[PDB]
Amino acid sequence: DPIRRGDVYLADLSPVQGSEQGGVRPVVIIQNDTGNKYSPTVIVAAITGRAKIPTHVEIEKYKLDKDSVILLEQIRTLDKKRLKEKLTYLSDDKMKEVDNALMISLGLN
Amino acid sequence: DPIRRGDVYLADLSPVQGSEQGGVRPVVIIQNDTGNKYSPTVIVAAITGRINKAKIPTHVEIEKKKYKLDKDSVILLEQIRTLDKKRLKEKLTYLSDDKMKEVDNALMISLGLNA
């Protein structure tokens, strides 16, 4: 498996345009778990290889090829078919950080 | 002129896959205005023609009369994405403060946030 918020998957994000984050990489699920259970789509934030940016969350400890960063300014809705290997899932504390970054990114406060 | 949260732009979402919303269509800007000013990208939510009355927590309806829209429409806060600004075409309108509050609420729900 069931897809859950906080899970990290591999996903082919290509193709992309301009300054969009592309290439088959890791992403973290940020959609609520009702949508994750039933809907054909999920919402994710891009993760990339590694400053102090309010919309960025660092992740060391997570089965990752390198020290990475979650980009909360880089988010999108993907068909579940795009999801490949499940890698890990983030701690409750790290998800609190993601939640904070996401609020700032989307001007939610 | 500047791109502002709550603005509605016509935008090119193609190409996409499966149930991802594609096509050239209205989107609403949901990124904060610091990003909208300085960043090469914006984050938006897709808007589609209202195909049926339905009470969906992640959906927010828009009045065709109230705004400059071809049809009665609905904002899909489960269909969002980060777009290079070059994908934005014409600025169509912008949403009221009250309508934007509904959007923020639908967005909190969609993204499993609560406050």
UniProtKB/Swiss-Prot annotation, chain A:
Gene3D superfamilies assigned:
2.30.30.110
Q: Which GO terms describe its biological process?
A: mRNA catabolic process; rRNA catabolic process
The annotated dependence of activity on temperature is: Thermostable at 90 degrees Celsius.
The source's superkingdom equals Bacteria
Q: Cite the EC number.
A: 3.1.-.-
Q: Tell me, in a sentence or two, what this protein's role is.
A: Toxic component of a type II toxin-antitoxin (TA) system, cannot be expressed in E.coli in the absence of cognate antitoxin MazE. Ribosome-independent, sequence-specific endoribonuclease that cleaves mRNA, thus inhibiting protein synthesis and inducing bacterial stasis; it cuts between the first and nucleotides of 5'-UACAU-3' in single-stranded RNA. Its endoribnuclease activity is neutralized by coexpression with cognate antitoxin MazE.
| Protein's UniProt name | Endoribonuclease MazF
This protein's species is Staphylococcus aureus (strain N315)
